[PDB]
Amino acid sequence: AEKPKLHYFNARGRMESTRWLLAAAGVEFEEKFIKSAEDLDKLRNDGYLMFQQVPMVEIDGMKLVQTRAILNYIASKYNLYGKDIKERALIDMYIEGIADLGEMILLLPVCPPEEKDAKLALIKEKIKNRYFPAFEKVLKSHGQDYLVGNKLSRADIHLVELLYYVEELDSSLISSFPLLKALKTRISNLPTVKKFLQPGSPRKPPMDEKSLEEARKIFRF
Ligand SMILES: N[C@@H](CCC(=O)N[C@@H](CS)C(=O)NCC(=O)O)C(=O)O
């Protein structure tokens, strides 16, 4: 059958959570890297990008854009979206909080230098006093290895991805949250996730100066 194909540039950006979810599901996929503004303009002009943006993923005969549309489809297709409407409500609540915090961190490299220190201080406050307490409370309420329904869901994958990024910012932020530490360890030892964390996978590194320079050239900003 059709192997999913991911269109993005060679960076984490807004495509990385899709790489994580597919890899955790054990799904082999291909990447086609946008390398220039001209490559992106070609995808646009040829009609493959509904809103003239990437990420775009070719899957099951669709040319899907919008990261949440992509992720919702992949999660349902591979049984990572709970078992019923009520479990989906819990999953959706959890992953939208993860997305809110993830978006703050995603945009740090494009923060104006005079605002960066204060932006980071606000993110750390929210991590320590709002988001990490909320997810620690979920894990403590039921004591299970997984956030919802006692089985792996996209919520476990998205949260553990975020925990790795929080660790890159400040490895002390998770220190008072032992259940989050334990989730990070367990999920990382799942065979599919372990393979994704090992070298040679589609997992991408933190954006550096040269990668930011490429992004400015490709996306003209
Ligand atoms: N809400 C969209 C945002 C997509 C988006 O902002 N993509 C950027 C790259 S990360 C882009 O293609 N920007 C070019 C532009 O908007 O013209 C999503 O979640 O996919």
Curated annotation (Swiss-Prot):
CDD domains: GST_C_Alpha (cd03208), GST_N_Alpha (cd03077). It is found in: Cytoplasm. The keyword Transferase applies. It catalyses: RX + glutathione = an S-substituted glutathione + a halide anion + H(+); prostaglandin A2 + glutathione = prostaglandin A2-S-(R)-glutathione; prostaglandin J2 + glutathione = prostaglandin J2-S-(R)-glutathione; (13S)-hydroperoxy-(9Z,11E)-octadecadienoate + 2 glutathione = (13S)-hydroxy-(9Z,11E)-octadecadienoate + glutathione disulfide + H2O. The modification N6-succinyllysine is found at K3. Pfam families: GST_C (PF00043), GST_N (PF02798). The isomerase activity is inhibited by S-methylglutathione (GSMe). This is Glutathione S-transferase A1. The keyword Acetylation applies. PANTHER family: GLUTATHIONE S-TRANSFERASE (PTHR11571), GLUTATHIONE S-TRANSFERASE A1 (PTHR11571:SF107). Its EC number is 2.5.1.18, 1.11.1.-, 5.3.3.-. One of its GO terms (biological process) is glutathione derivative biosynthetic process. Glutathione binds at Y8, R44, Q53, V54, Q66, T67. Residues 2-82 form the GST N-terminal domain. It comes from Homo sapiens (Human). Liver. GO terms for cellular component: cytosol; extracellular exosome. Glutathione S-transferase that catalyzes the nucleophilic attack of the sulfur atom of glutathione on the electrophilic groups of a wide range of exogenous and endogenous compounds. Involved in the formation of glutathione conjugates of both prostaglandin A2 (PGA2) and prostaglandin J2 (PGJ2). It also catalyzes the isomerization of D5-androstene-3,17-dione (AD) into D4-androstene-3,17-dione and may therefore play an important role in hormone biosynthesis. One of its GO terms (molecular function) is steroid Delta-isomerase activity. Changing A215H: Confers ability to hydrolyze S-glutathionyl benzoate to glutathione and benzoic acid. Optimum pH is 8.0 for the isomerization of androst-5-ene-3,17-dione. The C-terminal domain may form a component of the hydrophobic substrate-binding site, but in contrast appears not to be directly involved in GSH binding and is not absolutely essential for catalytic activity. Residues 84-206 form the GST C-terminal domain. Belongs to the GST superfamily. Alpha family. Changing Y8F: Decreased isomerase activity.
